[PDB]
Design a protein around this nucleic acid. Structure first.
Ligand SMILES: [Mg+2]
Length: 86
RNA sequence: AAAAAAAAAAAAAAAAAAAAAAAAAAAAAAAAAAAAAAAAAAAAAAAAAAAAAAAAAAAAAAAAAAA
């Protein structure tokens, strides 16, 4: 979401669910609260894949000087496998 | 006229040198002189002389998530 003050202050530009191919063990609804929303005909979302689209998006926002506020982001970036600098 | 075979098997043979009382020399200070198997027989590995071994390297984490 756009953390900058403006007309889209806090308005998302990404709310994307995962195009996941194989079987997923845990839904982790106590940790994530997914529907599961990772259905392709039952999207109810922009069910979008990382493969060069949104990984490029976050990578470019890393690249351009757009700092990433939020909570507990360190291990999040680890499980992403992005290495956001200091 | 003491005048002997002139060398197998790589045969085989020389030395390449001394107490010197020559003249009026006492009784081991040597540094130690020191042989036995063979009835189926003697039998260290680790790396081998402590002539001076202080020998607990602090700890504390109230706990996660990730709605
Ligand atoms: Mg958390």
């Amino acid at each position: 979401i756009r953390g900058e003050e403006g007309e889209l202050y806090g308005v998302p530009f990404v709310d994307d669910y995962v195009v996941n191919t194989n079987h997923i063990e845990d839904y982790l609804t106590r940790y994530s609260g997914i529907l599961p929303g990772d259905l392709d005909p039952e999207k109810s979302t922009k069910r979008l894949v990382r493969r060069n689209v949104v990984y490029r998006k976050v990578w470019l926002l890393m690249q351009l000087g757009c700092v990433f506020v939020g909570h507990g982001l360190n291990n999040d970036f680890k499980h992403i496998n992005i290495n956001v600098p200091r």
